[PDB]
Design an enzyme around this catalytic site. Structure first.
Site, PDB file in Angstrom:
ATOM      1  N   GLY A   1       0.647  -3.969  -4.062  1.00  0.00           N
ATOM      2  CA  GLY A   1       0.699  -3.031  -2.955  1.00  0.00           C
ATOM      3  C   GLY A   1       1.225  -3.722  -1.722  1.00  0.00           C
ATOM      4  O   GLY A   1       1.184  -4.947  -1.618  1.00  0.00           O
ATOM      5  N   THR A   2       1.724  -2.919  -0.784  1.00  0.00           N
ATOM      6  CA  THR A   2       2.333  -3.465   0.417  1.00  0.00           C
ATOM      7  C   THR A   2       1.998  -2.581   1.605  1.00  0.00           C
ATOM      8  O   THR A   2       1.742  -1.385   1.455  1.00  0.00           O
ATOM      9  CB  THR A   2       3.857  -3.599   0.273  1.00  0.00           C
ATOM     10  OG1 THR A   2       4.182  -3.916  -1.084  1.00  0.00           O
ATOM     11  CG2 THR A   2       4.382  -4.720   1.170  1.00  0.00           C
TER      12      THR A   2
ATOM     13  N   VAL B   1      -0.855  -7.036  -1.330  1.00  0.00           N
ATOM     14  CA  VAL B   1      -1.837  -7.467  -2.308  1.00  0.00           C
ATOM     15  C   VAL B   1      -1.072  -7.887  -3.550  1.00  0.00           C
ATOM     16  O   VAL B   1      -0.207  -7.145  -4.040  1.00  0.00           O
ATOM     17  CB  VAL B   1      -2.875  -6.372  -2.623  1.00  0.00           C
ATOM     18  CG1 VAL B   1      -3.820  -6.845  -3.710  1.00  0.00           C
ATOM     19  CG2 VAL B   1      -3.652  -5.977  -1.368  1.00  0.00           C
TER      20      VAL B   1
ATOM     21  N   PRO C   1      -8.307  -3.845 -13.100  1.00  0.00           N
ATOM     22  CA  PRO C   1      -7.054  -3.442 -13.762  1.00  0.00           C
ATOM     23  C   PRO C   1      -6.905  -1.958 -13.981  1.00  0.00           C
ATOM     24  O   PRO C   1      -5.807  -1.515 -14.330  1.00  0.00           O
ATOM     25  CB  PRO C   1      -7.070  -4.204 -15.089  1.00  0.00           C
ATOM     26  CG  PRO C   1      -8.462  -4.712 -15.240  1.00  0.00           C
ATOM     27  CD  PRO C   1      -9.127  -4.738 -13.929  1.00  0.00           C
ATOM     28  N   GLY C   2      -7.945  -1.161 -13.765  1.00  0.00           N
ATOM     29  CA  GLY C   2      -7.822   0.263 -13.996  1.00  0.00           C
ATOM     30  C   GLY C   2      -7.021   1.003 -12.961  1.00  0.00           C
ATOM     31  O   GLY C   2      -6.679   2.168 -13.183  1.00  0.00           O
TER      32      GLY C   2
ATOM     33  N   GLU D   1      -5.981   2.551  -9.006  1.00  0.00           N
ATOM     34  CA  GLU D   1      -6.538   3.407  -7.976  1.00  0.00           C
ATOM     35  C   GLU D   1      -6.955   4.758  -8.521  1.00  0.00           C
ATOM     36  O   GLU D   1      -6.248   5.359  -9.332  1.00  0.00           O
ATOM     37  CB  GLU D   1      -5.486   3.640  -6.884  1.00  0.00           C
ATOM     38  CG  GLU D   1      -5.052   2.381  -6.175  1.00  0.00           C
ATOM     39  CD  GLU D   1      -3.921   2.584  -5.185  1.00  0.00           C
ATOM     40  OE1 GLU D   1      -3.453   3.736  -5.033  1.00  0.00           O
ATOM     41  OE2 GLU D   1      -3.516   1.574  -4.556  1.00  0.00           O
TER      42      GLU D   1
ATOM     43  N   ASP E   1     -12.492   3.945   6.032  1.00  0.00           N
ATOM     44  CA  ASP E   1     -11.222   4.125   5.330  1.00  0.00           C
ATOM     45  C   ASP E   1     -11.415   4.736   3.955  1.00  0.00           C
ATOM     46  O   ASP E   1     -10.686   4.419   3.012  1.00  0.00           O
ATOM     47  CB  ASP E   1     -10.408   2.831   5.271  1.00  0.00           C
ATOM     48  CG  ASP E   1      -8.899   3.096   5.197  1.00  0.00           C
ATOM     49  OD1 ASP E   1      -8.474   4.246   5.480  1.00  0.00           O
ATOM     50  OD2 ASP E   1      -8.144   2.163   4.854  1.00  0.00           O
TER      51      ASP E   1
ATOM     52  N   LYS F   1     -10.769   6.977   1.023  1.00  0.00           N
ATOM     53  CA  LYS F   1      -9.687   7.787   0.483  1.00  0.00           C
ATOM     54  C   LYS F   1      -9.431   7.313  -0.943  1.00  0.00           C
ATOM     55  O   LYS F   1      -9.828   6.199  -1.296  1.00  0.00           O
ATOM     56  CB  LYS F   1      -8.414   7.660   1.324  1.00  0.00           C
ATOM     57  CG  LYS F   1      -7.892   6.243   1.476  1.00  0.00           C
ATOM     58  CD  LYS F   1      -6.687   6.221   2.373  1.00  0.00           C
ATOM     59  CE  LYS F   1      -6.164   4.829   2.520  1.00  0.00           C
ATOM     60  NZ  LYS F   1      -4.935   4.853   3.334  1.00  0.00           N
TER      61      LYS F   1
ATOM     62  N   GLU G   1      -6.968   6.118  -2.602  1.00  0.00           N
ATOM     63  CA  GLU G   1      -6.212   4.884  -2.822  1.00  0.00           C
ATOM     64  C   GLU G   1      -7.066   3.632  -2.663  1.00  0.00           C
ATOM     65  O   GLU G   1      -6.683   2.570  -3.171  1.00  0.00           O
ATOM     66  CB  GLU G   1      -5.023   4.818  -1.865  1.00  0.00           C
ATOM     67  CG  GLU G   1      -4.069   5.982  -2.019  1.00  0.00           C
ATOM     68  CD  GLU G   1      -4.298   7.137  -1.018  1.00  0.00           C
ATOM     69  OE1 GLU G   1      -5.457   7.587  -0.762  1.00  0.00           O
ATOM     70  OE2 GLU G   1      -3.260   7.607  -0.491  1.00  0.00           O
ATOM     71  N   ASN G   2      -8.213   3.727  -1.994  1.00  0.00           N
ATOM     72  CA  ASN G   2      -9.078   2.581  -1.772  1.00  0.00           C
ATOM     73  C   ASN G   2     -10.219   2.480  -2.767  1.00  0.00           C
ATOM     74  O   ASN G   2     -11.099   1.635  -2.606  1.00  0.00           O
ATOM     75  CB  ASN G   2      -9.623   2.596  -0.342  1.00  0.00           C
ATOM     76  CG  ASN G   2      -8.584   2.209   0.661  1.00  0.00           C
ATOM     77  OD1 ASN G   2      -7.545   1.649   0.303  1.00  0.00           O
ATOM     78  ND2 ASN G   2      -8.869   2.444   1.930  1.00  0.00           N
TER      79      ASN G   2
ATOM     80  N   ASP H   1     -10.504  -2.628   0.360  1.00  0.00           N
ATOM     81  CA  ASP H   1      -9.860  -2.459   1.655  1.00  0.00           C
ATOM     82  C   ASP H   1     -10.877  -2.222   2.761  1.00  0.00           C
ATOM     83  O   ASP H   1     -11.107  -1.083   3.180  1.00  0.00           O
ATOM     84  CB  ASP H   1      -8.825  -1.339   1.617  1.00  0.00           C
ATOM     85  CG  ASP H   1      -7.889  -1.384   2.804  1.00  0.00           C
ATOM     86  OD1 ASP H   1      -8.186  -2.130   3.772  1.00  0.00           O
ATOM     87  OD2 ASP H   1      -6.852  -0.692   2.759  1.00  0.00           O
TER      88      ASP H   1
ATOM     89  N   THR I   1      -7.055   7.257   8.088  1.00  0.00           N
ATOM     90  CA  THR I   1      -5.922   7.953   7.532  1.00  0.00           C
ATOM     91  C   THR I   1      -6.020   9.416   7.954  1.00  0.00           C
ATOM     92  O   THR I   1      -7.113   9.993   7.877  1.00  0.00           O
ATOM     93  CB  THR I   1      -5.979   7.818   5.997  1.00  0.00           C
ATOM     94  OG1 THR I   1      -5.973   6.421   5.645  1.00  0.00           O
ATOM     95  CG2 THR I   1      -4.799   8.514   5.340  1.00  0.00           C
TER      96      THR I   1
HETATM   97  N1  LIG Z   1      -5.761  -4.135  -7.026  1.00  0.00           N
HETATM   98  C1  LIG Z   1      -6.956  -4.683  -6.792  1.00  0.00           C
HETATM   99  N2  LIG Z   1      -7.651  -5.071  -7.773  1.00  0.00           N
HETATM  100  C2  LIG Z   1      -7.390  -4.789  -5.386  1.00  0.00           C
HETATM  101  C3  LIG Z   1      -6.604  -4.101  -4.473  1.00  0.00           C
HETATM  102  C4  LIG Z   1      -6.856  -4.182  -3.115  1.00  0.00           C
HETATM  103  C5  LIG Z   1      -7.912  -4.954  -2.651  1.00  0.00           C
HETATM  104  O1  LIG Z   1      -8.135  -5.032  -1.303  1.00  0.00           O
HETATM  105  C6  LIG Z   1      -8.722  -5.634  -3.553  1.00  0.00           C
HETATM  106  C7  LIG Z   1      -8.463  -5.547  -4.912  1.00  0.00           C
END
Ligand SMILES: N=C(N)c1ccc(O)cc1
Length: 338
Positions: free
Chosen positions: A38-39, A45, A112-113, A115, A154, A156, A158-159, A172, A189
């Site tokens: 992610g960016t 990340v 690994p699952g 968002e 935060d 939502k 996506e987190n 997050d 958001t």
């Molecule tokens: N993708 C993850 N496993 C992940 C993503 C964001 C974060 O702040 C922590 C862990």
């Protein structure tokens, strides 16, 4: 008394770590870079692998100069200080943190699952039992965080990551803050902001309960309750005191949501004299075994499909950019406590 003693011990353990934070517990060349997960405007990340143990982690990398420019210094210090001090089954674990000339690094468990957002959009909407399973985890997590005087700010889809057992891991903490009373920062958001944030008021943990109402609505409908092409149009809808529910929502769900999406924060569930118990005791949660959820003894609605602890199939594809470290230290003073 059981809940009182649990939360008292939770606060004691949090405060000990809060007062004496861990620092500088790894370095960048202990890891191999695998993939960008992610960016954002000041960081990314990355899936990494520890070279000695072989364990996979999600490494959040924040560019110090961009953090300063986008006025996120206090927020990044909050995030690390809070994450290193909390401990709850539905909060992602921080394993290492460190900094270098250019960046701040937080190395967290890799989930690994992917968002919840991806899964929600793939399936369309979650059934009420499925939404309720996730909602219960958020209720317990907010009970924990709020008892430590923390506001999350935060929430939502996506987190919220889905782990190998189908349970949530909240990620997050970039907007999380320890707050006694009120705080004032405009952050979050748009679709999830409580009215009192939009109106520039001093606000409290009630904003997290509002956001839970938004999340439950979105999980059960497939779209959030306040939507529009421009934020200002979203904000007009949020402050209006009007929400429309799909006909497929149960009456109990509508009633809970009217009480979470209450524009008057002094009447909002989670912010009344009975606190979280108004939510836990609501009819929509009548089938929820709160202890069994906490103990992770409930079979989850689904287990994400993935091949192993390094699989990235549940995350999407981003341009792979360098992790450059300047030859000269940047912003040393601003990040001394990190
Ligand atoms: N993708 C993850 N496993 C992940 C993503 C964001 C974060 O702040 C922590 C862990």
């Amino acid at each position: 008394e059981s809940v009182k003693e649990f939360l008292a011990k939770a606060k004691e353990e949090f405060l000990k770590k809060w007062e004496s934070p861990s620092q500088n517990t790894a370095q960048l060349d202990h890891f191999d870079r695998i993939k960008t997960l992610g960016t954002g405007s000041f960081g990314r990340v990355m899936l990494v692998k520890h070279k000695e143990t072989g364990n996979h982690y999600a490494m959040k990398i924040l560019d110090k100069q961009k953090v300063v420019k986008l006025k996120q210094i206090e927020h990044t210090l909050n995030e690390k200080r809070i994450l290193q001090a909390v401990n709850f089954p539905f909060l992602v674990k921080l394993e290492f943190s460190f900094k270098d000339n250019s960046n701040l690094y937080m190395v967290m468990e890799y989930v690994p699952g992917g968002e919840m957002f991806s899964h929600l959009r793939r399936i369309g909407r979650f059934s009420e039992p499925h939404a309720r399973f996730y909602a219960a985890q958020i209720v317990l997590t907010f009970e924990y965080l709020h008892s430590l005087d923390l506001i999350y700010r935060d929430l939502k889809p996506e987190n919220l990551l889905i782990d190998q057992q189908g349970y949530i891991q909240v990620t997050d903490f970039g907007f999380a803050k320890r707050v006694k009373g009120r705080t004032w920062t405009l952050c979050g958001t748009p679709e999830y902001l409580a009215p009192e944030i939009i109106l520039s008021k001093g606000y409290n943990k009630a904003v997290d309960w509002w956001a839970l109402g938004v999340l439950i609505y979105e999980m059960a409908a497939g779209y959030p309750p306040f939507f529009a092409d421009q934020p200002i149009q979203i904000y007009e809808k949020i402050v209006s005191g009007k929400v429309r529910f799909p006909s497929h929502f149960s009456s109990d769900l509508k009633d809970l949501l009217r009480n979470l999406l209450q524009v008057d924060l002094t009447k909002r569930f989670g912010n009344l004299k009975n606190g979280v118990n108004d939510i836990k005791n609501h009819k929509w949660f009548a089938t929820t075994d709160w202890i069994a959820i906490y103990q992770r003894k409930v079979e989850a609605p689904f287990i994400p499909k993935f091949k192993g602890p390094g699989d990235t199939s549940n995350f999407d594809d981003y341009e792979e950019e360098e992790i450059r470290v300047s030859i000269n230290e940047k912003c040393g003073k601003e990040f001394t406590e990190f």
